[PDB]
Design a protein around this ligand. Structure first.
Ligand SMILES: O=C(O)CCC(=O)C1=CC=C[C@@H](O)[C@@H]1C(=O)O
Length: 252
């Protein structure tokens, strides 16, 4: 078993760009940005519980990393960057730190490096448990209307929220719930020390208007690219700015 993905072949010999969406996303998330890198090969992955990988269940990050490894092998990917947004950024950091053969660098957009005490982990465990129950029992248009009013999405306007609710409501609430619990920030290690000692290149992207993750990026041993006029999902709101940042990172 491998993850569902969409592959696009670029110039032979250039690295693959392996894109990981965020929670409730799917393999289309990064395509507006990724297809700008037409000379690279692109792998747009559906994480467990998401898109065409809905039926793939995992118990935690070890299982996700293993699935990612198998997927890369299946596509004959030998030399690649991992590019992850939010949950996908956390998956990317976990997989990179656990070890992926052929990884040359990681680019994380708004991915949390980990909580730092038991109180915070308990709070997140409880909060994620409440969302899990909502995803199991409520109309997804109602759940996502509240999802996109969380603080990390405060910066959005009403039009943006309406569009996102409509988009994300194409999803399986049960498999979203299973994945939300399995890869909850509550169960993630604090990766700051590991990221500091990294063998792989590590870059951070953050929307200008994403106050939480601008502060987090400052705690990290990475070059941080602040994306103008963008919130947490900076590549969605300012794709041209994210393409420019990715070009600076990749082509140097
Ligand atoms: O874009 C979205 O709707 C969600 C982005 C996303 O992956 C996350 C948002 C907020 C909390 C988490 O569940 C998750 C994350 O881990 O970043």
């Amino acid at each position: 078993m491998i993850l569902h993905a969409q592959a696009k072949h670029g110039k032979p010999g250039l690295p693959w760009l392996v894109f990981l969406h965020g929670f409730s996303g799917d393999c289309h998330e990064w395509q507006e940005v990724g297809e700008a890198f037409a000379d690279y090969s692109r792998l747009y992955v559906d994480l467990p519980g998401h898109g065409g990988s809905a039926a793939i269940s995992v118990d935690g990050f070890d299982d996700v990393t293993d699935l990612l490894r198998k997927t890369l092998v299946s596509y004959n990917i030998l030399d690649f960057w991992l590019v992850g947004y939010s949950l996908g950024g956390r998956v990317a950091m976990m997989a990179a730190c656990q070890g992926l053969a052929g990884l040359c660098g990681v680019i994380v957009e708004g991915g949390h490096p980990g909580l730092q005490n038991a109180e915070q982990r308990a709070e997140r465990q409880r909060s994620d448990r409440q969302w899990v129950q909502r995803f199991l029992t409520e109309p997804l248009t109602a759940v996502f209307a509240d999802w996109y009013q969380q603080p990390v999405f405060a910066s959005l306007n009403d039009d943006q929220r309406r569009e996102l609710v409509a988009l994300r409501s194409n999803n399986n609430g049960a498999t979203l719930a299973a994945m939300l619990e399995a890869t909850s920030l509550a169960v993630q290690p604090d990766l700051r020390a590991n990221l500091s000692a990294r063998t792989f290149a590590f870059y951070y992207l953050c929307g200008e208007r994403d106050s939480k993750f601008r502060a987090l990026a400052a705690e990290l041993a990475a070059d941080c690219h602040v994306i103008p006029r963008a919130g947490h999902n900076a590549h969605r709101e300012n794709p041209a700015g994210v393409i420019a940042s990715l070009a600076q990172i990749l082509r140097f």
